[PDB]
Amino acid sequence: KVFGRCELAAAMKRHGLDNYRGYSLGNWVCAAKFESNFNTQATNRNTDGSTDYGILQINSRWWCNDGRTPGSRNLCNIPCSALLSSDITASVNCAKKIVSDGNGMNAWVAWRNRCKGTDVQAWIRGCRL
């Protein structure tokens, strides 16, 4: 599924991301925009044996299990396929786990690069929430 920004914002808000651990909703929408262009099926296969999965491009070394990645920790306790669902449950819960394990949003390279320090509220402006 390719989300729209306001639809994704509403879904992320229902799943508890607005101001989760100090990150207002627009941060999460912006991260998704630049990680995956809102595409729940986005899949980036890296040369280190890992892959980045789903709307938030969560990586298979630490976070999800794909059975092909060296050093796997599976800290979200999920198969990486769950991160390719059209429903954002697993991706949101794993994103929460990333932050609960002491990572900032700086875990997401696209957030660091396209979203940190910008007017991220623009990503939710004009959305029904």
Swiss-Prot record:
It catalyses: Hydrolysis of (1->4)-beta-linkages between N-acetylmuramic acid and N-acetyl-D-glucosamine residues in a peptidoglycan and between N-acetyl-D-glucosamine residues in chitodextrins. Coiled coil: none annotated. GO terms for molecular function: beta-N-acetylglucosaminidase activity; identical protein binding; lysozyme activity. This is Lysozyme C. It comes from the Eukaryota. One of its GO terms (biological process) is killing of cells of another organism. InterPro entries: Glyco_hydro_22, Glyco_hydro_22_CS, Glyco_hydro_22_lys, Lysozyme-like_dom_sf. Substrate binds at residue 101. Its EC number is 3.2.1.17. Lysozyme C is capable of both hydrolysis and transglycosylation; it also shows a slight esterase activity. It acts rapidly on both peptide-substituted and unsubstituted peptidoglycan, and slowly on chitin oligosaccharides. Monomer. Lysozymes have primarily a bacteriolytic function; those in tissues and body fluids are associated with the monocyte-macrophage system and enhance the activity of immunoagents. Has bacteriolytic activity against M.luteus. Gene3D superfamilies: 1.10.530.10. It comes from Gallus gallus (Chicken). One of its GO terms (cellular component) is endoplasmic reticulum. It is found in: Secreted. Keywords: Allergen, Antimicrobial, Bacteriolytic enzyme, Disulfide bond, Glycosidase, Hydrolase, Secreted, Signal. PROSITE patterns: GLYCOSYL_HYDROL_F22_1, GLYCOSYL_HYDROL_F22_2. Residues 1-129 form the C-type lysozyme domain.
